[PDB]
């Protein structure tokens, strides 16, 4: 249930004081937990990053990071009603559609695009056909993997076509939720890595509190859309940055 | 062909040799590639597959 103790704090202190010195890892600024479960979570990895809601620590503000928005076919309505609204007029670094995205950025330009942006956010209608447009660099692992957003707050019924409108308070709202909370992507096996906290924006008690938040949310009985995924007994946590070892926490 | 040599000097040393896959498809080392170091171009009898292993028997 509740796990926050001196072994966890000792591990995170040791890793922080290791990353502030260790010259083979002077670039990685991110803390991830490696949830080791017992039973195999059966759900297959589609690349839709589900959102783990934190309660009292927004771990990224939606204005200090580059955001790429990938839209539907014509993109005129989304581009204008995003850029000249003053609610979202300075939120997105770039707004390009799928057609001219795969026209422009091919090959090594995709490595430049990956090194260029820091949050890839796509429309939920055109999100599924990104992995051949965006390449393998975005989907090997998960750190710039694209997030779904709805743009309209309109549901699609059969026998009738969705009217095309976009809502900039809604796009700011769910982008605020996306940069606010953290996210996980499930798989078939037992391992599951979640990014919680940063290297210098966050401190040890807030990282511990949002770690425990993600433990609750993943092991929970409710939130069976998103969070009911640890259906058995969780066995371990580890903590690492992107090129460290795995400092163990909560050995069951 | 990817890696049986480590450099263009080695492939230059072994140009024109006869190689073959494990499926008996004969072939011959044509030219050292430029950009990766130990890679080369070989011309075979017909279209080899990606699942094959080329072979240079030497003594």
């Amino acid at each position: 249930d509740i796990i926050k103790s001196g072994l966890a704090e000792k591990a995170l202190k040791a890793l922080i004081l290791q990353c502030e010195e260790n010259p083979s890892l002077k670039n990685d600024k991110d803390i991830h937990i490696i949830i080791n479960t017992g039973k195999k979570m059966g759900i297959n990895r589609d690349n839709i990053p589900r959102i783990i809601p934190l309660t009292k620590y927004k771990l990224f503000k939606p204005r200090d990071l580059n955001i790429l928005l990938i839209t539907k076919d014509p993109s005129a309505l989304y581009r204008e009603t995003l850029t000249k609204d003053e609610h979202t007029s300075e939120l997105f670094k770039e707004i390009i559609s799928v057609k001219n995205l795969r026209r422009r950025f091919k090959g090594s330009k995709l490595t430049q695009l990956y090194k260029d942006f820091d949050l890839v956010v796509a429309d939920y209608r055109v999100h599924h056909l990104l992995p051949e447009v965006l390449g393998s660099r975005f989907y090997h692992g998960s750190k710039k993997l694209p997030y779904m957003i709805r743009m309209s707050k309109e549901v699609k019924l059969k026998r009738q076509q969705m009217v095309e409108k976009c809502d900039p308070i809604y796009v700011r709202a769910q982008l605020r939720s996306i940069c606010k909370n953290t996210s996980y992507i499930p798989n078939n096996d037992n391992c599951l890595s979640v990014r919680v906290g940063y290297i210098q924006k966050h401190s040890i008690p807030e990282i511990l509190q949002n770690i425990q938040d993600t433990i609750n949310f993943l092991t929970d009985k409710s939130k069976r859309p998103q969070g009911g995924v640890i259906k058995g007994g969780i066995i371990s946590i580890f903590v690492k940055t992107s090129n460290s070892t795995s400092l163990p926490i909560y050995q069951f | 062909i990817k890696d049986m040599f480590s450099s263009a000097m080695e492939v230059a040393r072994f140009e024109g040799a006869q190689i073959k896959t494990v499926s008996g498809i004969r072939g011959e080392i044509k030219r050292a590639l430029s950009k990766p170091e130990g890679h080369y171009r070989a011309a075979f009898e017909d279209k080899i597959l990606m699942s094959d292993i080329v072979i240079l028997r030497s003594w």
Partner: protein
Amino acid sequence: IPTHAPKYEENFNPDKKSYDPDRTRSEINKMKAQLKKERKFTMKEIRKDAK
């Protein structure tokens, strides 16, 4: 009329390269030309005795 002075090197040789005042671009460019001509000559020699 404004009056500028002509930049030139006294005691010129057009076959010799000019004096880049850096020694970490001129020397690496010297050994770039050295490495290229000696690599091309060496592997040309070994592919012709392979023939």
